[PDB]
Amino acid sequence: APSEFLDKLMGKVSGYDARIRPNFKGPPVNVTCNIFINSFGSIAETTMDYRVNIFLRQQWNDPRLAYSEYPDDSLDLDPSMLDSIWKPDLFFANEKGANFHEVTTDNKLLRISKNGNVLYSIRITLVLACPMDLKNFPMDVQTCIMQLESFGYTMNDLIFEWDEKGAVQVADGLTLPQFILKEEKDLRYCTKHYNTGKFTCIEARFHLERQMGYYLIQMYIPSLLIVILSWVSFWINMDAAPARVGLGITTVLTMTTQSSGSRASLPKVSYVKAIDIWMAVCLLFVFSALLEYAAVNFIARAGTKLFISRAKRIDTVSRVAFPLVFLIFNIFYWITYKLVPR
Amino acid sequence: APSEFLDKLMGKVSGYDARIRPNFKGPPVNVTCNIFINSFGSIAETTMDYRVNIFLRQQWNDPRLAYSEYPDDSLDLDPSMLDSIWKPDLFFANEKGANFHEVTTDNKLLRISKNGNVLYSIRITLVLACPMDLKNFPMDVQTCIMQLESFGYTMNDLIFEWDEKGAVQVADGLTLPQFILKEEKDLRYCTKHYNTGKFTCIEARFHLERQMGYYLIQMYIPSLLIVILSWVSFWINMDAAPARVGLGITTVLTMTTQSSGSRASLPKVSYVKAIDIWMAVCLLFVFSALLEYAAVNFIARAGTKLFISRAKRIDTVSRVAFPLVFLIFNIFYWITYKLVPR
Amino acid sequence: APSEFLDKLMGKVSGYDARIRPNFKGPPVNVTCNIFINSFGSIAETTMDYRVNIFLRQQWNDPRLAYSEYPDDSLDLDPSMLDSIWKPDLFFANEKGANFHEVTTDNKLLRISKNGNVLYSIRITLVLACPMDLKNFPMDVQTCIMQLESFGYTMNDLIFEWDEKGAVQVADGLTLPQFILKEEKDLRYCTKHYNTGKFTCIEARFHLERQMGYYLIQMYIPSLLIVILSWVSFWINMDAAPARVGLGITTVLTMTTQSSGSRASLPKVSYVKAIDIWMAVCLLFVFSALLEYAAVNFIARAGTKLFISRAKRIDTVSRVAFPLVFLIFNIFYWITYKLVPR
Amino acid sequence: APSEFLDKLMGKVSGYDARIRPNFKGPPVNVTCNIFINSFGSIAETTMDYRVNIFLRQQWNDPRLAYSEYPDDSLDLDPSMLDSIWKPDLFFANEKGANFHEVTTDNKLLRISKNGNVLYSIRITLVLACPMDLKNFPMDVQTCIMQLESFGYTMNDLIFEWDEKGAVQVADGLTLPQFILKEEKDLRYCTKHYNTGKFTCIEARFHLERQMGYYLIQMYIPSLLIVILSWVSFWINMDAAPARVGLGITTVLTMTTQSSGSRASLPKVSYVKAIDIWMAVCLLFVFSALLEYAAVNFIARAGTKLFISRAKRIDTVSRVAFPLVFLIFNIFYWITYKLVPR
Amino acid sequence: APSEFLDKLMGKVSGYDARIRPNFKGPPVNVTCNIFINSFGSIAETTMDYRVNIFLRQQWNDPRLAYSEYPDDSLDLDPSMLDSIWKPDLFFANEKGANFHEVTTDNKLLRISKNGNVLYSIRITLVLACPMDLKNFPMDVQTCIMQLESFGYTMNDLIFEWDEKGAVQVADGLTLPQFILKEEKDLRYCTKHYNTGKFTCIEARFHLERQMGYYLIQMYIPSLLIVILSWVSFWINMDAAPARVGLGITTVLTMTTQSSGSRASLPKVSYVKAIDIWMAVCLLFVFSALLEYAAVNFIARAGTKLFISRAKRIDTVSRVAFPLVFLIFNIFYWITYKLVPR
Ligand SMILES: CC[C@H](C)[C@H]1O[C@]2(CC[C@@H]1C)C[C@@H]1C[C@@H](C/C=C(\C)[C@@H](O[C@H]3C[C@H](OC)[C@@H](O[C@H]4C[C@H](OC)[C@@H](O)[C@H](C)O4)[C@H](C)O3)[C@@H](C)/C=C/C=C3\CO[C@@H]4[C@H](O)C(C)=C[C@@H](C(=O)O1)[C@]34O)O2
Ligand SMILES: CC[C@H](C)[C@H]1O[C@]2(CC[C@@H]1C)C[C@@H]1C[C@@H](C/C=C(\C)[C@@H](O[C@H]3C[C@H](OC)[C@@H](O[C@H]4C[C@H](OC)[C@@H](O)[C@H](C)O4)[C@H](C)O3)[C@@H](C)/C=C/C=C3\CO[C@@H]4[C@H](O)C(C)=C[C@@H](C(=O)O1)[C@]34O)O2
Numbered sequence A, B, C, D, E: 001a002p003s004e005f006l007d008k009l010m011g012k013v014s015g016y017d018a019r020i021r022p023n024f025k026g027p028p029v030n031v032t033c034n035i036f037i038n039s040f041g042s043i044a045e046t047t048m049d050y051r052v053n054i055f056l057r058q059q060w061n062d063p064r065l066a067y068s069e070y071p072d073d074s075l076d077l078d079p080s081m082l083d084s085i086w087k088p089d090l091f092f093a094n095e096k097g098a099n100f101h102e103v104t105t106d107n108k109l110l111r112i113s114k115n116g117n118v119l120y121s122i123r124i125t126l127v128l129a130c131p132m133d134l135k136n137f138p139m140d141v142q143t144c145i146m147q148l149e150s151f152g153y154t155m156n157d158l159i160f161e162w163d164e165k166g167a168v169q170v171a172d173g174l175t176l177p178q179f180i181l182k183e184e185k186d187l188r189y190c191t192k193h194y195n196t197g198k199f200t201c202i203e204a205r206f207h208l209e210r211q212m213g214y215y216l217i218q219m220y221i222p223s224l225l226i227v228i229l230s231w232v233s234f235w236i237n238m239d240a241a242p243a244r245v246g247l248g249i250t251t252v253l254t255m256t257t258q259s260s261g262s263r264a265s266l267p268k269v270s271y272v273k274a275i276d277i278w279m280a281v282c283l284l285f286v287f288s289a290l291l292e293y294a295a296v297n298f299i300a301r302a303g304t305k306l307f308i309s310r311a312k313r314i315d316t317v318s319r320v321a322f323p324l325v326f327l328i329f330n331i332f333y334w335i336t337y338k339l340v341p342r
């Protein structure tokens, strides 16, 4: 009897056809699909893509599946039965490849309401290639988008609509080590025009903000320290050229290395990153320090002690100048990027 | 005759249906599942996931499979027969992808007791994404969790229960090169609430403790050595500025490199790692050493021999001071992290 | 009735055979295929290949599929039905491996016009091995080619023709981080002669131009800076040999490192890259600077003050000479590669 | 007729059942299986696993397959026929994943003797995770083990036995770039006890010895050279502090780098590697050299020429001492690890 | 009618059996197979394997497929039909894994001549593990071999023969960035003896020669340059110890780094590479230069000006000596490896 009902509803009997669209030659089937995202992982600037595995819940009703037989409002069909019924055909457009998880049983959940409402749920792993603007790199906000489109049928045949309440849910305990996701999530329609015809698509937005802890600790602090080293360099007498030339050279080299280190993590990009203007100014200051020492030597290795007194003056006034120029730059710098954002 | 019994029990005859849940429209099927874990491998902080391949043994009884025909209490069915019978549908929630091992035969073991108890065993390889807190990195205890949930049916239909005795077993000879697993294993229920309904889950806990041998040998000892180099630097006369500036610079650079080296292995993280406070203090001491030499020079390059005597005093008192401040820091440091843990 | 038409047109009835070519033993089937390319990604010089995922739209008409039954000009058949009809067999020749995207439904779109025109669309991910000439590396234009050939039948049986209008389309918002694609796209026939017979092929051209921003910021500027360091080195008195030897050595070493850094990204290649002539000249200038200092010392460590005056002359005239020789080289250099291209 | 015999022996006729074990409800089936190993490849200490692809030849007789029809002692059945007959189910326990090679035809060889002896051969690629002890790393002997167990049936049902003569064969021309395999091969039974029951297993042993050429050339020689540099450092007068401090520092730094270099290849391990005691002693000697120079300076920068004469004595006696202490250490070192092994 | 002929020739009618070998119980089937290689790619010394994707064309005639029905000499069967006919079973022995390309249609080409000659063509991607001798690394000739063997049947059943004319063809435009392939190609039989029996194999030879451009530009030139730096070092007066010690140390360090750099690309190997003798001699010369400076100091820091004159003599005679010893070594070196090869 219970098997007999799976056989009666879905059997060849009643002439049910998998291939034919529900309510065919008529109003477009409306699919309400909401996604529950388990995790973001392996977000890489260089690879340019981010991994997310999601439950996809799509709901479409067809009149023909509706049954008067059982008391229960919704009956849970077997996962295999699902291969038999018509399914809405939905591919991630930017998907860059994706896979089901078939571990143990195939992971799929389907249930038919007596009304004829169908609930269909699948667990997918997605790699998604999102374009991301690095115009200001360290502290930027990046938007990651996923758009679900129907490759099979045109606009008149099929439509996608987000669920009116709670269209995208996130894991209760989900955190990203590198970025923080924002509670506010934008959802917006799109319509794709292709040579073949117009295909429906719906896209979610995700907003992610870069954690400043790691970059502060790694990128900025050593720069600050190295810049301190020039400052301590100034106090040593000009008579010892090696100590000054040694500090200047060593510091400029280290700044070079520190600068490349930032570059290795990132994808190769034409426009100047904020990190680059920071490195350019730090390097400009150490180079200017060595430059000042060079000028002091040009005056000192030249001649008369009156000039050497002049140079002992420029030493003090310089040592007072550099922390001020660096500090004022720093102040002027932080406001634009980390304050009044967007 | 023996084939005739596989054909009689599992045949179309008797109207056995694969798709229908055992004891349908009634008390939820109870699955007692215990796992035997062959190995942990490729645990990587950066990838954030750990590999484990496990035997999964799940036991559920259904009345309809029960047979009075044979003398034997448990009969071992063919591995293919398994595709025909109803199986409890169980997916690892955090699985991040997983695969069966089909090498030679498909690796699956099933047996039916005359009572109707079914024993079902499969060999799976799992990658598992466990969130791990690095708040104190080198010596931390990390908890790795795996939760088994039923994607197919709600709470009223199906339930998972760990076996009362020996729910998780480990290989007799299993060792992890990086961590040690703890004999005490916590097992605790969870219930998942999703928009679709409430799904049963059961989760194991694994506790892993970081081996301090490698990090002691690699991370800490070279730091100690480099800090010794400042100490030997102090004894050289202040008259030779290059030897002192050379030692100070070289040591601070090496400390910088040593510090980055720790960072390369780890995933990028916002909160300060214990290794970082260690590096910060070591670097602070070498920098303070160079700083003291700079002050000594400010007094020395300045003027009168009374001051130079003053500086020869500060040399000795400093050389006595640094091992004490470093030693007291070290003592104060170890207690918090490696003593009175958690 | 609607199922009955899928059954009538494609049924065993009417004796339709999948295996037989349309209009068999006659004029070669003509396939008009246009591709819509979603993205280029992971273009790597070292791996030598570039990833592109494309929609492939191929159109061939066969008389036998044509139907008089429906009012609609084009009817959209089910994606599975596609396995039944004869398909033009088309493999990417240089494909180096490729995969369909079967996520959710298999992603395939097919429709039959009453005329008998068939539209067939598939979404594919391609890795493509394109040979690329590095003769001038940093600023080069690279051509990436994909050729679609029929492995199954000879020229007399089958032919490929690009669509007369809009044979290749690109995503409206598509950008490549490393290169820019050019609007002008060349399309040209090819015919392959193999021992078996002659097979049709059609190949698209893509032209890509290297972004000069990243290489300017990374490769060239540090070179400029390091070359500046020699210039500042000259001013320090020759009396201090260490400062001069220190600057010369340090700079030549850094130039060595900078040079290798360029090499690591690129595939190993026999012919000299433009970047290499740039590095060779920069290194030649720093080496020549140190060389001049060495000559100055050979005169200076030798003897009489008249010679030392001679050397103080060569210092000034040299410091005036080096920026001129470097600047004139730079000017002479840029014209060939970034100006009057091809 | 020849097809008729495949149809008669393996047909539904005679009531042959694939699922049922040979000689069912009786003495355990005995499988004699010998392996021919094509190659070892990609043996990596860090990944901890080694690749081997093997032919597996397993022989079990069943009475029912035996035929009186043909003259030939052994008849070669079609590779597909193999799917129909019962196969012994054998999975590599530590397999960590493995794959068949299906290129061209599926690669499988089966033949049935009239006696009823069945020869079954398959070509498999295995990744095998072998635990390996690094207690003395550079020159160690490592044992790699593969154990073949039956996941399907208990001890009473099935048994594995190595072939009495030539159970494991190796390719005639097989060589490993990193290790050498030893002709003597140990083969030993194991029995696995699991909660389900006792399962048969048979394990091969492979013994591999590390090639000392590469590590001698790479690891040890540069250490020797750097240690020579301290020796040449001693001869330079103590009056020039920079040359001595320069050599001491530079050499200790280089030793640090050389030491890390060894570490990068290896998996992270708690226990001290032999390479580490070697590095510790080399570094101890360079550090002791710099230390002696520091003491000499403490005496020299202090005061009276009688002390400076004392120091010129300690220079000579030291320069005589260091090659002796290093040489005697070297001698004492090599004996334990490369002599009287195990 | 045309379908009726596929049904008549290959139908169950006429009692055609896929499983049975052509001309069974008789003279061994003779397969003439020629390969057309599209590309070599990703040849890596470290991975030890090289990728090649090839068309495999194998020709065997069977009497039973021969038909008198059509006028055409050769008829092209459908790619699926191929699964039905008997195929020669041919696996690459060293294949290390390989895959078909199933993109769009499965890529397979088959045609049956009325004579009964069958032409069968498949497109395969192969990874091939070739053993390669590095005894002289930079400029070596390496032979890469692929051997095609029949795993299914013995010598008496099946045989492989290369096509008498043009057995291996190469792409008209094929080039390898790292090596050049030689027009002369050796083809030679092999017979494999295994415990099971004797299996036929045929192997192609490929000869590849290393491009000297990249290694000249990268490996050798910087060595030459660094060796020049010692030469320029000699001219500086011995009075400044730091400039000489600085140049000697810096150069020996850089030589160390340059030496390791070569090692990173290559697989770990016991026997001494030619590149190693080159590095050993270069390093020996820089070390000998520093050594000579040390001796000069032992004489100079010692005492009387007559000795200092002696040392100013050894300076000149040395500076004349080193370019000669290095040049004569270079000459003596190149002849063995790049001249009179093999
Ligand atoms: C003339 C430069 C000399 C050598 C000066 O160098 C120094 C010191 C003083 C010298 C006189 C140091 C140098 C920076 C320069 C000053 C330059 C800048 C602050 C910026 O660059 C300028 C010019 C540049 O166009 C030549 C321009 O880019 C274009 C590219 C695109 O158009 C096609 C477009 O997007 C738009 C038009 O922008 C830029 C906007 O503006 C800044 C971008 C450069 C930073 C420099 C660096 C950043 O990572 C490098 C690395 O970390 C390293 C090793 C050293 C750094 C350095 O060496 O920093 C570094 O190379 O000062
Ligand atoms: C002012 C710093 C100057 C340059 C001082 O530098 C030195 C020497 C003396 C200078 C005056 C050396 C420097 C450390 C500083 C002292 C700083 C610390 C001990 C710590 O940082 C402070 C400030 C920091 O917030 C600015 C704060 O982080 C926040 C981040 C998050 O909020 C958004 C939150 O999680 C919480 C609020 O915590 C921290 C807790 O506390 C410590 C974290 C820094 C260690 C420094 C380093 C660790 O890896 C780096 C690397 O190995 C390297 C190359 C050098 C190191 C270094 O250069 O170490 C390094 O960069 O002293």
Ligand SMILES: CC[C@H](C)[C@H]1O[C@]2(CC[C@@H]1C)C[C@@H]1C[C@@H](C/C=C(\C)[C@@H](O[C@H]3C[C@H](OC)[C@@H](O[C@H]4C[C@H](OC)[C@@H](O)[C@H](C)O4)[C@H](C)O3)[C@@H](C)/C=C/C=C3\CO[C@@H]4[C@H](O)C(C)=C[C@@H](C(=O)O1)[C@]34O)O2
Pocket: C256, C257, C259, C260, C270, C271, C272, C276, C277, C279, C280, C281, C283, C284, C287, E212, E213, E216, E217, E218, E221, E222, E224, E225
């Ligand atoms: C004699 C050289 C001495 C050591 C000189 O070195 C320096 C300084 C002065 C010394 C006297 C520095 C050196 C370059 C040389 C001058 C050489 C060139 C400008 C070029 O090379 C010459 C000769 C070379 O054939 C020996 C020839 O290649 C052939 C190869 C192929 O035939 C089989 C064919 O394609 C065609 C015939 O071309 C070339 C065309 O032309 C240039 C190619 C070399 C650049 C050098 C380098 C580029 O990356 C290297 C790296 O960044 C590094 C660490 C240092 C660089 C360097 O060390 O640069 C570097 O190694 O000058």
Ligand SMILES: CC[C@H](C)[C@H]1O[C@]2(CC[C@@H]1C)C[C@@H]1C[C@@H](C/C=C(\C)[C@@H](O[C@H]3C[C@H](OC)[C@@H](O[C@H]4C[C@H](OC)[C@@H](O)[C@H](C)O4)[C@H](C)O3)[C@@H](C)/C=C/C=C3\CO[C@@H]4[C@H](O)C(C)=C[C@@H](C(=O)O1)[C@]34O)O2
Pocket: B212, B213, B216, B217, B218, B221, B222, B224, B225, D256, D259, D260, D270, D271, D272, D276, D277, D279, D280, D281, D283, D284, D287
């Ligand atoms: C006090 C050390 C000072 C800094 C001394 O450092 C130097 C010079 C003189 C200083 C006074 C140099 C230093 C070694 C020390 C002497 C130490 C050893 C020879 C060994 O270590 C000792 C102590 C160590 O337990 C603290 C102990 O490990 C335990 C770990 C486990 O228990 C939990 C267990 O398995 C068992 C109990 O063993 C060890 C057995 O025995 C040796 C192991 C250390 C070698 C050092 C190094 C090896 O790779 C490192 C790297 O290449 C580098 C950059 C420098 C090396 C160095 O710096 O070498 C290095 O760090 O001497």
Ligand SMILES: CC[C@H](C)[C@H]1O[C@]2(CC[C@@H]1C)C[C@@H]1C[C@@H](C/C=C(\C)[C@@H](O[C@H]3C[C@H](OC)[C@@H](O[C@H]4C[C@H](OC)[C@@H](O)[C@H](C)O4)[C@H](C)O3)[C@@H](C)/C=C/C=C3\CO[C@@H]4[C@H](O)C(C)=C[C@@H](C(=O)O1)[C@]34O)O2
Pocket: D212, D213, D216, D217, D218, D221, D222, D224, D225, E256, E257, E259, E260, E270, E271, E272, E276, E277, E279, E280, E281, E283, E284, E287
């Ligand atoms: C005693 C050596 C001292 C330290 C001398 O070092 C220097 C300078 C002068 C010192 C007195 C420098 C040193 C080489 C030596 C001279 C040695 C050689 C030219 C060669 O080696 C000798 C001895 C060696 O067996 C100990 C032997 O190998 C065996 C291995 C196998 O048997 C089991 C077998 O295959 C066969 C018997 O061959 C070899 C054939 O012959 C040469 C091979 C060594 C080259 C050295 C190096 C190559 O890459 C290394 C790297 O780039 C680096 C950082 C420095 C190099 C170096 O340091 O080079 C380096 O380590 O001279």
